[PDB]
Nucleic acid binder design. Sequence first.
RNA 1: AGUAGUAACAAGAGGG
RNA 2: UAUACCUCUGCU
Lengths: 99, 49, 750, 10
Amino acid sequence: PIITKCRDTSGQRRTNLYGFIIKGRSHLRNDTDVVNFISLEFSLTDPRNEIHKWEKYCVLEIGDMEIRTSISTIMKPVYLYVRTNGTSKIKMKWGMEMR
Amino acid sequence: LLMDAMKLSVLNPAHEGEGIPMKDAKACLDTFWGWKKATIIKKHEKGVN
Amino acid sequence: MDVNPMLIFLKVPVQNAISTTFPYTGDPPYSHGTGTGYTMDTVIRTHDYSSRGIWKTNSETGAQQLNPIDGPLPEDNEPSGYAQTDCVLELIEGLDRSHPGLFETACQETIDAIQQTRVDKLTQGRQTYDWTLNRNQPAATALANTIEVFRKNGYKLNESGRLIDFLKDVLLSFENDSMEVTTHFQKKKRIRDNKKMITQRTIGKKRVKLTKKNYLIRALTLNTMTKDAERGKLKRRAIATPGMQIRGFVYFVELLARNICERLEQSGLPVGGNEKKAKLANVIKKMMAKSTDEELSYTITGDNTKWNENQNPRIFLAMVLRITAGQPEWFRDLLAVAPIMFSNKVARLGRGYMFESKSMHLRTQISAENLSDINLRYFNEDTKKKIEKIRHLMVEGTASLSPGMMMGMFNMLSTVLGVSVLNLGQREILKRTYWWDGLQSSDDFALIINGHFKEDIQQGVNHFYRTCKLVGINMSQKKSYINKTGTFEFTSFFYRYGFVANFSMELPSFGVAGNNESADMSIGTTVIKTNMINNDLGPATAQMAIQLFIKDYRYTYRCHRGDTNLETRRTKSIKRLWTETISKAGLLVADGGPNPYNLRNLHIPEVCLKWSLMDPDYRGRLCNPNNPFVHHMEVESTNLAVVMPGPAKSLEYDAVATTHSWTPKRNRSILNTNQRGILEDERIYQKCCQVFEKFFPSSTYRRPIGMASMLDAMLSRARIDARIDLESGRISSQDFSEITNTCKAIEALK
Amino acid sequence: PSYSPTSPSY
RNA sequence: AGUAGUAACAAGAGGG
RNA sequence: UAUACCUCUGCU
Ligand SMILES: [Zn+2]
């Protein structure tokens, strides 16, 4: 699962979930050897408004969300951006060090 | 996803990397209802959708 | 508003905000697959730059060798390698005049070295190409392999122990026309098991004789591969590895060039970063002092294009012979060996290529040796052309490569050529309206040109540029540039009326080094420390760099603080230690303890820093000298790691030997190959060396010298130690007979 | 604005 | 498909 | 030839 943890300005600690990643096989020998994965990530972005951005993705509509605002609850559809992707031991190493 | 990402979340006293990932993940899914039957709204042109 | 970081340069000078132009927090480029494409590119291009020279077939190898030196003078600005012997010797003579007694003492120090140097010295350093196996191997195994095969044939001068005798054996080995080598190969035996019969892979050895060509080709062979992780370049490039035959000669030539460079103001090598800056500061100081107020100063931020490909082994032979003038002729001829082998060098073409069939869905590997005879229908248009050009140079799998050099072959003597062109710029030699000085380290240079008017600078540049062409040096017109003296760049140091910080260069050194828990903590805190001093890492960011390192260290080694709610494979055992411990502050970070570090104590090793605050029993376990985790190495390789900024140097760190000073598991891929036996050799050699150290404790500190046998040395010690321990000591009379009976029993077994 | 597309109040 | 990028990965080898 | 397994390897 794609998770992060954080604290608000108000101080409350919180766990967020963005989506999921399904790891393929990973007999990674060379530092460039590839792991195939599938990322399934939530979004409210309509992909058709900028379809060139999403060449590699297959976007699903998976739900409806009642979103609270100032003084009006809004109804927006919930998309799921699915795609096959890949990474390597070296690329993962440098991702772990992004701090 | 960068700017286009969307989060399901829970209030949770846990620290910056605490708890079992899939247990936390299910906790986040249970906050959201109104899942639909899934439908393709934008195809991956080169792939079996 | 669209955000653009480049607009910061409107207010902030580019040198002062240079960190924003170094993208060194992302993974650098890696080559995937073979470097044969690049090795051929290099070999083809090397010959193109020398193409107007003189082709001649070699008497001993049959390799087709291009000689461009003393050739036709170039008529364009393209990369040329038509170095002129007389122009080189003039510059080297100029260098001798300007530094009287330098060549003398440089040679005198190199003489003393050659006498004192042992065969041991080639166990040190990077991987060498092994002619025994046609592969890269660690230095010491390539040495032991060459000594074994030399010993098996008629060559044992190196039995003395001195290196010059091993070097004799190498030159004497070219005369053999039937050199014998034991190869290894897999055998599929069948044995019964309890009640079915299963197939079994085993390995047996077979002797093979080699031609006079075959052996000679292999001794002049230098391996090739692609350079990985290289910053600042779109395209990959090929690098090379010297073989065992040439290496000991190269050691002594580079040693001479080092002793020369050590006493040359204009050489950046072999000094470190801060001293390079001091040296550059001196020439700017010296150029300004010696000019008048009427005169100008411009500085070339300088790069030499195609540096290695146009530096010729024949020119290196001219240099070495001129530098050694008037010294003993044995010493001249010894140092002359390396340039000669470089002139007749041959390059292995690499792994080869991989082919793919879309319709059949299969893949196949072909060797680079097959490039001579294979059909060209498989290849793309560019690769096919390269194979056709390479076929003309091809010699028994390898490709001949007389002219030029390749990266990772040879070091400091090429800087001496550059420095001699810098030395030509003195007022007292040129006597013109212009004059120059500067600093050089390999292909990079900073040149300062002074003159009375801007026209004099132009004439000065052309004189420098054209003189450099006459010795096979090609200044890049694309990458070099000129401006009034006051700002320049040199090996990613940026001067702006003084050297400024380039912290982003160092960003890849901020992390968990991956040696072990002990070494990494020391290394990590010292990286922060040395950057505060050397690269303007401010105190707040340095505090945060401690914080982030501790996070990275805790996650990587799964050693989170003992009072954490996290769950890893180690949390339970660390929790047991946490609750058991009275003084928690004394626990190391690797044992779940708190971080002690802040700015003031980065230079203090962790165990030392926490020693007062440790529980007695924990400390006594932690630093227990009887623990099974440490590798009791030699003194010379104690507290050394390896780092890459240069080639690949060693980093010494400060740490107390503990249970955290452990070593990770060895790679186990060798178990599937024919070289499987090498593991057993090592296991046997280690037990033999382990037992010797029980008779000679000081062998772990100082390498013992002796032409005598290892068993015989141990036996001599076995007797006499038993003697003094009884004669005047605390050993019984019955035990002295028990030890000498065993020594006599061992003496009987031979 | 009215809401957050990245951390929406639901 | 996807990673990727001047050539590879998308397991290799063996029980044949 | 296919499908199951089994063994070694993950910088060599
Ligand atoms: Zn932590």
